[PDB]
Structure formats: C-alpha cells, structure tokens
C-alpha cells in the first residue's frame, strides 16, 4: 500500500491560511485584512522584530454547508502564535460581527484555528486585552451559534486561548494536539523539575495531549491527522447545534470530581481518564 | 404684427419717445437720469436691479432713491442680492411694495423691520438661478437697471469680470419688450476701445456714465487672521474624512472662514496626505484670494466662476489656464453659468449655517432677521435630473450593484456646534418655524432640509447621514456629533463606540487626525499679506483688508 | 495576608467564606446605595487540596468554584426586579503552575470561571473589576477581566500583566518603560484606555475610612454608569494606544 | 461674569506646568499646575453668566471615563464657544504630560 503513504494529506502540514482555505466550502474562501491591506502589528517595529503583514492571523468569511460563517486561523510560524494587539483585535472582532450577524437573522458561525503560544510579550497587556474580548465574544456569540475550535499542532494551544478553547461549543483535537494553560518550561521553572520535566516529550503528550484530552472529555473529538478528515468533523458538529451540556457549564459536577481525588501524590493520565 | 398682438412693443415705443428729447440716441445725460427714470418706469414695474452679490449698479440705485414716489410707486423689485441701503430706502420712502429676492446680508434686521410695518411685502426668498428662472415665466420683468465697466455710443457693453448676474437679468427684459438701462464706468468714443462684448447693443435700450465706479463688494473674501485652530479641525476632517473619503474630484465652497480653511490646508494638511492632483481639481467658485495657494501649489485645474472678488482681477488674468477669460485677456463670470454647473455638474457642496435641527434640516434665517438663502437651496440639495456618474457620486449607493439605485450629490454642512455669540448651532425648533408665522409664509424658510445632507462636519466630528436608514437614525447621527448643544446633550456618550465602529460618525481619531494637532501653523498664508505674496504681487486687496 | 482578602472584609464585613465553597474563595451578598451586590474574591488559602495553589492563585478550585458562585447568582436572579451586581475583587498573583492543574485542566476549569461571568454581564447583571492588587494572566482573565467596568487603586503594587517580572526579565530591566503594552505600572495600562477610574488611597494594605467612602462612591457611580447602557465591552476601545484595536473592527464591519 | 468652582476625580498629581491660550474676546487661557491626589480642582471665570451646566457638561466628556491626573486648573474665559474651550484644554493637557 505505498500508494496510500504516497497520498497522505495532512492537515498539520499546511500554513494558516492553507488550513483556512482547505476547510471552508470550495470557492468561498474570502479573506478579511489580508496581508495588502498592511494592517500589521504597531508595537513590533520599535523594538526591533520584523511584522508580518496579516499579524500572523487569518480572518475569512466564507460557506460551511452553504451555511454563513466566519473562520480565524492563528499562523503558529509567526511569534510562536502568540497574540498582539492586531491579531487578537483581528479575531475579536470577527467573532463580535458573527454574533450581530445572529442578532439580525443571520445564522453566522465561527470557526477557530487554534495554533498558539498565548500572549505575545512585546505587546502583552494589548494581547491580554484582547484574549479577554476573544473570550466574550465567544460566550455572546454562543447564545446563537457553537464555536468549534481546531487544536491541530504542532505548536497546539496554550495560556489565555486555551482559555478561550475551553469556551467553545466543540472542541476538536489531533493526537500531535497539545492543550494547556501553562506551557512545560515555564511550569518546570515556576515548580521545578519534580513537578514538571519540560524535556520529556511523551509525558508533556500523556497528560495534556490530543489523545488524553479527548479520553478525559477535555475534548469532543479525536481526529486523524487528515484534511478531509478534519473538514467533515467540523462540519458534523456545526451540524448538530450548541451541545445541551457543555463542559463549562458543569462546575458543580468537576468540583465534586475534584473533592473525591486524593491529592496528596500525582495523579497520571490513567488516574485522570479514572477520575472523570 | 397686428395691434392687439403688440402691446408690450407698442408701451416699449411710447416710453421711450418720452425720454427722446432728453436723451441722445442710446446715450444718457447723467444730470437727467432721475427724470428718464419717471420717463421709462412706471408704477407697478417689476423692476430687476443690480444688488448682485458682488457687483451693484449703485448710480442707478441711488437714482432711483431720489424719485418723486407720487410718479413711481408700487414697483416690484426683483433682486439678486439686497445689500445697499438706497435697496431698502425704496420702501420706506413708498417708491417700491414688493421684494422678489435671493440673498440679503447686513439689512437682515430692516428688511424684518420694513415688513412688520407693512412698507414691503416678500414674494418669496430664492435661490439666484431659481430667480433668474421665473424671469421668463411667472416674474418677466418691465425693467433692468444693470452696471458694466464700458459701453460704446450704440449700446454695446463689457462687463468683464464682473459678469456676474447681468446676462441672465438683461436677457429676458430686452426679449419681452422690457427696458434695459446699463450704467457704465466709461463711455468710449471709439467702438474698437471696448475690450469686449458682453451684452450687446441690441439688448441694451440706454446707457448712462456712472458719477464713479459702480460699487463692488467683496463678499466671499476672507480675511486669513480670522480662522482659528477649531477652522481647522473641522477643515482637516473634511478633507481627510470627506474629500479623500469619497475621492472628490469637483465642488463649490460655500461662503465663509470653515471652507477658507479648508482652501489654506490644502497645500499643507492635504499635501501631507499626498491628495495633490487627487482630488478638489474642478472648481465652481468666485475667485477666492484664499484659493491662490493651493492654485500656486497646483491643486486647482479649473475654476469656473460666479463673479468676482475685487483685487483678484490681475491675478486671475495671469492664470488664463485655470480661469475662464476671453480675449481680451480678462475673466468672464456668469452667475447663472456657475450656478448651473454647481447644481449638476460637481461631486460636492459644503457650507456653513447658523441653525441646524434635529432632522439636519438648516437655516439662516433667525428671528427678525430675514437672511436670504443665496446659492445655498441650489448647490445643497441632490440634483435629481442628474444621470452621469462620477465616482464621488456613486460612492454614496448603499448597494453598488443595485442598477436601480442612483448616486448622490455629497452635500455637507460644516459648522461648529455654537456660534461665536454663545447660542447652541444645534437647536430643537428653527428659529425659522416662528418667521414663517410671524410673516406669514406658507412654509419655514429652510436653506437646506435634512433629507438632502449627506455628511454634518462639526468640530467634535463627522456624522454620514447618508448611511441613515431611517429618520430616527439620522438623528441619533446628528446627536452623536452635535456636542453640548440641546440636541447634543441627548446623545448616550456609551453610545459613540458603536456609531463609530459602524462608520456611522467618525471622530477625528478614527481619521488618523489628533485633535491638539490643529493649528494656524496649517494655514499656507496667515494674512492678506501673504495671500498677496502666494500671488506674486499681483492680488491688490480692496481697502478694507489693507495694511499698508 | 492579602490585599484583596483585606478588601474584602473593608468592603463585605463577612470574612468567613461561605460553607460550600473552596477556601480559597470568599463571597458576600450584600447592597451597595440599596442595589443587590454580590462580593466576590480569590484569596490565598494556605491547605488548598492542590499544592501549588497555595500562594494565592487561580487554580482548579478557583476556577470552578467562580463559575459556580457566579452561576447561583445568575440563576437566583433569572426573575428579580434587578440583577444584582458581581464586584470582583481582583488580586491574583498568577495562574496555578502544575502537574495536577494541567493534568486535571486547569485551562478547562478557568473557563468556567470565564463563561459565568461573561454569561452574567450578557443576562444584565453589572459587573464591576476593582484592582487592589495583582491582576495577572489567567487568573485575571478568569477573575475580573469580563468586567464591564474596571476600576484600579492608583498604587505601585497595583499591575496588570501577561506574566510576573522575573519571568520577563528571565526571557530577556524595566526597558518596557519605552513600551506602554510591555509596561507594569498602573498608569501605562490606564493609557491603553481599560481602566474607567484610578483611584489613589491613603493607606492601600488596611483601607483607611476615608477609603472606604471614596471607593464604595466609586462603585456606586460605575453601577450607575452601567445600568440601561450597553452591555459589551465596547468601552475599552477608546484611547490612542489601542488605535489598531478599533481600526480592525471597523475595517472589519467595512468589508464583513 | 461669574466664578465658578468644579472638581472631579483625579489620580496622581500631574508634575509639569502649562498656560495655554489668551483673555482675547472669543477666547480662554487654561492655567494648568499639578494638584492634590484624587482630586482635580477647577476655577473658571467667564464673561458669559449663567453658563454653569454648559460648563459642567463640557467636563463631564471631557473626563468620561478617564481619569485625568490631579490637577490645578484656572480657566479665564471671554465667551470662547465650547468648541474653542474643548480644544484649549486638550492643549492645555497634551503640555502637562
């Protein structure tokens, strides 16, 4: 079957705005502030780093089965995906329209590509601002229509926007998919090597990767790592409307998981998978 | 022709055989003008004469100030512009009942007063074009009293520069049999020492040499001392907000120091937006000194012009390749001409006012003081037998692919938020509605009506009533930019963010404009003086804005 | 043993957190000018269940139980005359760090926190963030940063900031001085137009009684300035340094 | 003419000083000192009588929703309209800091 590993299309092998491309409806693909329009970062020139011209997201309208929708896509190969003041403005603000698109008939969805580092620190309070705004808009706009969030790699999701991934409706995941609040390294140096060994590649995947997630229910789906793939399970979800429960909504039932965990030794991915 | 088919010919010829002895040929003797004015008017006349907004046929209005009333009385006076005290004297001394106009200035307050006690009556108040237009209709009139600078011995007249009104006055009093007497500065001997032929001889019926010059006022000239920082906020966001926003190619400027403003950042302001050749590069407008910078600068590709301003005349006549003159070398207004293309054939009106309402509809008019519209109701308003597109024009569909729905005249209303006399710009009633019923006017006299602004430009910022959908909204718009005026204060300031996200309004900020930005530092010439110096000396302002 | 535990007590009286509660969690039901006011603080609690949460941070039980204090007074209020308001006191140090957190899902957990109170501010609840302290990352995010009005004590100890001191300069003294975004004092995030009032006091760690009165009047005007307006965020997009912020949007709605 | 007395909430005290403007017809000068933390402090002198609300609202947006720093200020006003008086005093500030 060589001809099979010869025909492998990966989802993770393609840029943002490929990725964006690829998963909106053939032909509708129509990109808000694209890279001509210069509207790039403020902050980074002064202090020496070259701007990219998008900011290092993409914004898209576009079909979903035929259906109006609206897809941010973060280029992790930019700042890591880490969040300025324009591309966290750029993904705001489109969510923000979709929810005014529903408040006027207009069934708009969003779509959320989630390769990020979190806030990017040459514009950190800028790009704290606006995950927070990212944030609220996700929650209005999921009083009309579920946001589905692509966790894809190889950079994964992590700091504030996991955050904001945790809002979503829908939470669909790769096993090379990373998602966390705090990154390895920094825990390593916040807790120490005990806590945390931010060189250990399968421990770093065993407890917050795509494959643990999804065991855990931290996640809704669990993707192969392939374009079609990918594109129909998105499309399914969005299908099936807002979920009746969503994990956010359930504090009482995790803190009481929560009370029932012997906290004195670490718990593993087993033990996690076990508890929920 | 047969007799019953001849009256208006036949009371022409007995009128005029009762000045044959005391007149030679066309020519008036100055010393009897006042009997040939008893002579060829009768009570009753309707009689249009020369208060145009710059020229005025003052020899012929003094003149006629000094009649016997119990020969002439009753006249109906037709008049462009009512500015000279002898216009008004008319009336109170019982010579003239009845006022046909367009623009009053100064004599706002008698012409008020001479109307509450009973001693004239308003026809109403017009646009020029719109009064030049019922001359051949519902107002042909009986006599032109007109000034110009040269006649011949047989009628022939140059009028030059000052143009102005005087065609479209002469021509429908000399064609219906009417008597058109002109007052010239200089009669000449020799016909080939007229520079040229503006109004021929067959038109003309007298002349007469002026005791001096007819008087010219120099109405649209502004003094460049006069503008102020806030001028120029407003000036820099309709030229950043506005004119750069709706790639203006054409426009008039209404009278006043907001759109002189606007004129002397041009080669400032607007060079450092790199507009030059971009945009304003057709003008309709009168010859404003305040214009000579950004023609030096090369802005200005034409200018077609109402009249004149006095000063301007040498100016103009070394820049034949902006301004129309004939070949004799000097410039050749016409009002009417100007008007016309002002109305159909331009992206942009902008001017001022001293009331605007809540619905934007805009006014001059305020109590007792009956102020004419001018050129205003003509060039603010959608011409809508308009059928070309230009892309200003067109910008202002909702819907571009919508082939039903045609494009809009930009028509903007630039004033700050309160008069300098510390009464608000933005009321809740028109001091106009009061007129009306004080007057008796069938209707408040409104310069310009809300339905027809597309953009109110004020110092707090842009409001695009063009994007209104409903009145309501239009006037939530006008509330949002309205500042601490009544109609500001019923603004909810958490209500701006929106309105200005939606482009709705745009404040300066949203312009890329910082308010403490603006400055007279902006302003390419700071003074007559330097207006003179943009000119190369050749701009001689009249008296009133010397310095030396 | 905390400014916002201090605040807390200053402003709510109660200073024994509630039955049900983590502990590391105080709240208050009370009134401020007669309007239904629910207090609402994450303090340091010295026996969290997890270990690294221990210093005052916002870890798995901070999250969810916000959510869940949130949630009960949403649900309590779903048919009031007047939704009562939610005052934040806001002084995180920062985000738990973890192998229980990320292992558990603390990002999930401080979603929840997130989704609560945004889902408040959307039903017509007020909400006010009152800065007396840190206000850092996550913590910050999922404690006070759905505010619909924030409200900072003018005090060096008070910073807004994406993360501490020592990590910043680790990964790199005070440069960031050149860079308003970058910087931690209290005026610089004023400057990006976030904040609706600085306040200053006399004494920051144990509020004095003139403190007291100007703060709880503070509240009360931002209560005021509230009620019957928009209840977005929109608020925040109002200085100069944050130009790019709403020139995206309106670029955005131009070409939507 | 009337003297007038405003104060609003402030933060730290402005540390410059700045005189903007003139006592010409139509026109203000702001005098602008740092003041007591807190607080902001403004005397106005106006030729125009009965105008306190128009000045109150002038302030009001002015300083909606962002606190100035604590300042001293005195306004001497000859009938500027709020347009002219608006823009002096962002002179007046942009100076201070």
Redesign the interface.
């Known amino acids: 079957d060589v001809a099979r590993l010869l025909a492998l299309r990966s989802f993770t092998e393609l840029g943002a705005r490929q990725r964006a491309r690829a998963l909106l409806d053939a032909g509708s693909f129509r990109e808000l502030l694209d890279p001509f329009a210069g509207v790039q970062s403020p902050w980074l020139e002064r202090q020496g780093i070259v701007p990219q011209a998008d900011d290092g997201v993409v914004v898209a309208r576009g079909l979903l089965d035929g259906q109006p929708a609206v897809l941010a896509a973060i280029e992790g190969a930019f700042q890591g995906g880490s969040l300025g003041e324009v591309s966290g403005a750029k993904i705001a603000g489109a969510l923000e329209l979709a929810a005014e698109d529903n408040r006027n008939g207009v069934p708009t969805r969003a779509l959320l590509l989630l390769e990020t580092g979190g806030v990017r620190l040459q514009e950190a309070n800028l790009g704290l601002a606006a995950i927070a705004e990212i944030q609220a808009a996700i929650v209005d706009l999921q009083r009309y229509q579920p946001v589905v969030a692509v966790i894809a790699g190889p950079v994964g999701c992590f700091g504030g926007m996991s955050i904001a991934a945790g809002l979503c409706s829908y939470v669909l995941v790769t096993r090379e998919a990373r998602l966390g609040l705090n990154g390895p390294q920094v825990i390593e140096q916040e807790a120490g090597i005990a806590e945390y060994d931010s060189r250990d590649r399968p421990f770093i995947w065993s407890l917050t990767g795509g494959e643990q997630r999804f065991a855990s229910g931290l996640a809704d789906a669990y993707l192969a790592d392939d374009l079609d793939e990918v594109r129909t399970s998105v499309l399914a979800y969005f299908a099936k409307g807002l979920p009746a429960r969503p994990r956010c909504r359930r504090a009482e039932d995790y803190l009481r998981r929560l009370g029932d965990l012997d906290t004195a030794e670490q718990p593993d991915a087993a033990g996690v998978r076990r508890l929920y | 022709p047969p007799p019953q088919w001849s009256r208006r010919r036949q009371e022409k010829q007995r009128r005029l055989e009762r000045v044959r002895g005391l007149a030679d040929g066309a020519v008036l003797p100055r010393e009897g003008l006042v009997a040939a004015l008893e002579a060829l008017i009768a009570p009753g006349d309707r009689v249009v004469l020369e208060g145009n907004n710059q020229k005025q046929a003052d020899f012929l209005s003094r003149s006629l100030a000094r009649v016997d009333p119990g020969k002439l009385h009753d006249l109906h006076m037709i008049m462009p512009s009512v500015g000279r005290p002898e216009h008004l004297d008319l009336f109170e001394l019982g010579i003239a009942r009845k006022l046909d106009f367009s623009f009053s200035g100064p004599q706002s307050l008698r012409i008020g007063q001479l109307l509450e006690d009973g001693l004239l009556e308003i026809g109403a108040i017009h646009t020029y074009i719109e009064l030049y237009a019922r001359l051949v209709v519902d107002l042909i009139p009986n006599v032109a009293l007109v000034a110009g600078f040269v006649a011949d011995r047989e009628g022939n007249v140059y009028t030059g520069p000052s143009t102005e009104d005087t065609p479209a006055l002469v021509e429908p009093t000399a064609f219906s049999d009417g008597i058109v007497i002109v007052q010239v500065n200089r009669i000449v001997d020799d016909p080939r020492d007229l520079p040229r032929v503006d109004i021929p001889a067959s038109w003309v019926d007298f002349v007469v040499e002026a005791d001096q010059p007819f008087y010219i006022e120099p109405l649209f000239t502004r003094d460049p001392r006069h503008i102020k920082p806030v001028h120029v906020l407003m000036a820099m966001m309709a030229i950043r907000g506005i004119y750069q926003r709706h790639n203006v190619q054409s426009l008039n400027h209404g009278i006043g120091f907001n759109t002189a403003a606007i004129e002397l950042i041009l080669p400032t302001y607007g060079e450092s937006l790199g507009l030059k050749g971009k945009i304003c590069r057709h003008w309709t407008l009168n010859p404003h000194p305040t214009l000579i910078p950004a023609i030096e600068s090369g802005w200005v590709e034409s200018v077609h012009c109402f009249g004149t301003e006095l000063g301007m005349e040498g100016y103009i006549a070394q820049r034949p390749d902006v301004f129309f003159t004939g070949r004799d070398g000097s410039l050749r207004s016409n009002r009417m001409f100007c008007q016309l293309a002002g109305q159909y054939a331009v992206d942009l009106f902008i001017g001022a006012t001293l009331q605007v309402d809540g619905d934007g509809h805009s006014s001059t008019v305020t109590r007792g003081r009956l102020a004419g519209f001018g050129g205003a109701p003509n060039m603010g308003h959608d011409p809508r037998g308009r059928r070309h597109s230009t892309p200003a024009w067109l910008d202002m569909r909702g819907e571009p692919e919508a082939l039903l729905e045609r494009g809009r005249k930009l028509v903007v209303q630039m004033v700050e938020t309160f008069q300098d006399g510390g009464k608000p710009t933005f009321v809740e009633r028109l001091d106009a509605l009061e007129v009306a019923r004080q007057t008796g006017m069938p209707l408040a006299p409104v310069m310009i009506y809300g339905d027809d602004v597309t953009h109110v430009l004020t110092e707090e910022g842009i409001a695009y009533l063009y994007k209104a959908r409903s009145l309501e909204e239009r006037q939530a718009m006008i509330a949002a930019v309205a500042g601490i005026s009544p109609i500001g204060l019923r603004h909810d300031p958490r209500e701006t963010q929106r309105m200005r996200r939606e482009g709705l309004i745009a404040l300066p900020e949203d312009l890329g404009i910082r308010r403490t930005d603006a400055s007279r530092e902006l302003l390419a010439a700071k003074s007559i003086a330097e207006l003179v110096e943009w000119s190369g000396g050749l701009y001689q302002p009249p008296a009133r804005f010397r310095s030396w | 043993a905390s400014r916002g535990l201090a605040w807390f007590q200053a402003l709510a009286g109660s200073l024994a957190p509630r039955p049900g509660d983590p502990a590391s969690l105080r709240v208050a039901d009370a009134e401020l000018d007669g309007y239904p006011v629910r207090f609402l603080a994450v303090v340091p609690d010295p026996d969290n269940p997890f270990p690294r949460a221990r210093q005052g941070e916002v870890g798995l039980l901070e999250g969810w139980g916000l959510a869940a204090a949130v949630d009960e007074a949403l649900e309590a209020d779903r048919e009031a005359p007047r939704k009562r308001a939610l005052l934040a006191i806001v002084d995180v140090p920062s985000q738990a760090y973890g192998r229980r957190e990320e292992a558990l899902g603390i990002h999930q957990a401080l979603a929840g926190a997130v989704d609560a109170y945004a889902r408040a501010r959307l039903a017509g609840h007020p909400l006010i963030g009152l800065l007396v302290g840190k206000a850092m990352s996550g913590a910050f995010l999922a404690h006070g940063y759905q505010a619909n009005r924030l409200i900072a004590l003018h005090d060096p100890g008070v910073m807004v900031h994406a993360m501490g001191k020592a990590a910043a300069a680790r990964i790199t003294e005070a440069l960031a001085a050149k860079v308003p975004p970058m910087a931690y004092d209290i005026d610089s995030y004023a400057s990006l137009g976030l904040l609706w009032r600085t306040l200053p006091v006399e004494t920051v760690e144990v509020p004095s009684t003139a403190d007291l009165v100007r703060v709880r009047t503070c509240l009360g005007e931002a209560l005021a300035d509230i009620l019957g307006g928009p209840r977005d965020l929109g608020g925040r997009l109002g200085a100069a340094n944050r130009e790019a912020s709403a020139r995206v949007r309106r670029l955005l709605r131009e070409q939507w | 003419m009337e003297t007038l007395s405003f104060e609003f ?1 402030a ?2 005290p402005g540390r410059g000083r700045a005189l903007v403007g003139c006592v010409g017809s ?1 026109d203000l000068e702001v005098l602008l000192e740092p003041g007591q ?2 607080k902001l402090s403004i005397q106005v002198q106006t030729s ?1 009588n009965g ?1 306190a609300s ?1 000045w109150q ?2 302030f009001e ?1 002015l300083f ?4 100035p720093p604590a300042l001293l200020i005195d306004i001497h006003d000859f ?1 500027a ?4 008086v ?2 002096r005093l ?2 007046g500030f ?1 100076e201070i800091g």
């Open positions: 909430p933060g730290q139509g933390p807190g125009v105008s128009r609202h002038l947006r909606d929703g962002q606190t009938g309209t709020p347009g002219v608006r823009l962002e002179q942009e």
